[PDB]
Every structure is written in structure tokens, then in C-alpha cells.
């Protein structure tokens, strides 16, 4: 049993995707981010960076006490290692997978997040910053599409944690002033993953 500390967000949805895909037992423990749930001391012990997602794995493979982890990327990696699923053990495909996973974590998510912030959250309008993060979103979707033109999935021939990590951010394209049709390979990969049974399950 995995407890997932969760708010309905792209980053939270990365973990429900994986959990449904891997067929792992879990429950959702809602964290209320508008009401400062993420600063509750006993959450900060689970997740010191004050963010969701975080998990508590009640059955760690060493059979010890529960294990807490934060950071969507490290949760996906830890769960891919634990299950043997959605991350290859072959050196080249594994490396390519990890590369795009770190790419999503360092680039896609931080930059689209700044985009969501300046366009849908900031008190006052900051044209330099809106332009700066809009151009970067486009570059990021161009990088994403470039790869998906050459490979069916980001790591090679198999669906992996790299695709799982990006999908919920692409799925918020409507909030990013992105026309998904400008990136046909992204558009197809997006619909392909939308129609996977586990994604369906996570979206209920």
C-alpha cells in the first residue's frame, strides 16, 4: 500500500498514472494547497520542500518502517525500480528514458509552471515575463515533438516513466496558450496516452 499525498495538478497526476499503470495498491491523501496543507509539520516531515506529490510506501522491499519520498521524478523512478515496470533495464533505452525524465523535471514542468503563473496567477501583467515563458514553452514543445517524430515513445519503443512524467503537463496545454496541432507528434502521443485504460482509470 502506497499513500499518495495529492492535489489535482499535473505533478500529482504523474503519480496516479503510474500507480494505475503498475497496478499498485494505493490511497489518496488530499493535501489542501490553497489552505496551506503543505506547511503542516507532519507533511513537512514527509515532504520537506513543502510540495506534493509525496508518497509513503507502507511496504518497502526491505520490509522496514514505511518509506517517505517526495519529488514526482524520484517517486516515478523509485516506483519503476521497485516494480520493474516503465523503466528499461537495458542500458541505452534506460539512459534515454532517464534523460527525458530529467528533461521534463528540469525544463518542461518548471517552464510551463512559470507560464501558468504569469498568465493565470500573477497579481499584475508582466509582458517581458509572459513573452519569455511563452517562447520557452514553444521551444519545449518543439523539442518534445522533434523526439516523438523519431521514436513512438520518449525512451525508445516502450511506454515509460518519461512519457508518464510529461503527459499531465501536455494535458494542460489548453492553459498554456499552445495549439497542440502545431505539434502533430505530440498531439498523437497525447491522444494515444489519453486512451490507455490506466489513464482512463486515473481520470476517474
Question: Is 40 marked within a binding site?
Answer: yes
**Closest distance to ligand GDS from the beta carbon of 19 (Å):** 15
C-alpha to C-alpha distance for 121 and 114, rounded to whole angstroms: 10
- Output the smallest distance, CB 201 to ligand GDS, in A: 21
CB of 14 to ligand GDS, least distance (A): 7
Nearer to a second copy, 110 or 196 (CB): 110
Q: How far apart are CA 25 and CA 32, in angstroms?
A: 23
38 is in an annotated binding site: yes
Tell me how far apart the alpha carbons of residues 160 and 153 are, in angstroms, rounded to a whole number: 8
Q: Scanning the structure block, which residue is given the C-alpha cell 513573452?
A: 131
Residues near a second copy (CB under 8 A) are 48-50, 60-62, 64, 67, 69-74, 77-78, 91-92, 95, 98-99, 101-103, 105-107, 109-111, 114, 122-124, 126, 128-129, 143, 146-147
* Biggest CA pair distance of the chain: 53
Helix (H, G, I), strand (E, B) or coil at 8: coil
DSSP state of 105: I
Residues from 153 through 182 that contact ligand GDS (CB under 6 A): none
Rounded to whole angstroms, how far apart are CA atoms 165 and 103?
Answer: 10
According to the annotation, is 195 in a ligand binding site?
no
In the complex, minimum distance from the CB of residue 66 to a second copy, in angstroms, rounded to a whole number: 11
Q: At what angle do helices 10-22 and 109-120 cross, to 10 degrees?
A: 140
50: contact with ligand GDS by CB under 6 A: yes
Q: Which is nearer to ligand GDS, 43 or 153 (CB)?
A: 43
- Report residue 64: phi and psi, to 5°: -90, -155
Ligand-binding site membership of 132 (annotated): yes
Enumerate the known binding-site residues for glutathione.
11, 38, 40, 52, 71-72, 132
Amino acid at each position: 500500500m502506497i499513500d499518495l499525498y495529492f492535489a489535482p495538478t499535473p505533478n500529482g497526476h504523474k503519480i496516479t498514472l503510474f500507480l494505475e499503470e503498475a497496478e499498485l495498491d494505493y490511497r489518496l491523501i488530499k493535501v489542501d494547497l490553497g489552505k496551506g496543507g503543505q506547511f503542516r509539520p507532519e507533511f513537512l516531515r514527509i515532504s520537506p520542500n513543502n510540495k506534493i506529490p509525496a508518497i509513503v510506501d507502507h511496504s518497502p522491499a526491505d520490509g522496514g518502517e514505511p518509506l517517505s519520498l517526495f519529488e514526482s521524478g524520484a517517486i516515478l523512478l523509485y516506483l519503476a525500480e521497485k516494480t520493474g515496470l516503465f523503466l528499461s533495464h537495458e542500458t541505452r533505452e534506460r539512459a534515454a528514458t532517464l534523460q527525458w525524465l530529467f528533461w521534463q523535471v528540469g525544463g518542461l514542468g518548471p517552464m510551463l509552471g512559470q507560464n501558468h503563473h504569469f498568465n493565470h496567477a500573477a497579481p499584475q501583467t508582466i509582458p517581458y515575463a509572459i513573452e519569455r515563458y511563452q517562447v520557452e514553452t514553444q521551444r519545449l514543445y518543439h523539442v518534445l515533438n522533434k523526439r516523438l517524430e523519431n521514436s513512438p515513445w520518449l525512451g525508445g519503443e516502450n511506454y515509460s516513466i518519461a512519457d508518464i512524467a510529461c503527459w499531465p503537463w501536455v494535458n494542460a496545454w489548453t492553459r498554456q496558450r499552445i495549439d497542440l496541432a502545431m505539434y502533430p507528434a505530440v498531439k498523437n502521443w497525447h491522444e494515444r496516452i489519453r486512451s490507455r485504460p490506466a489513464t482512463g482509470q486515473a481520470l476517474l
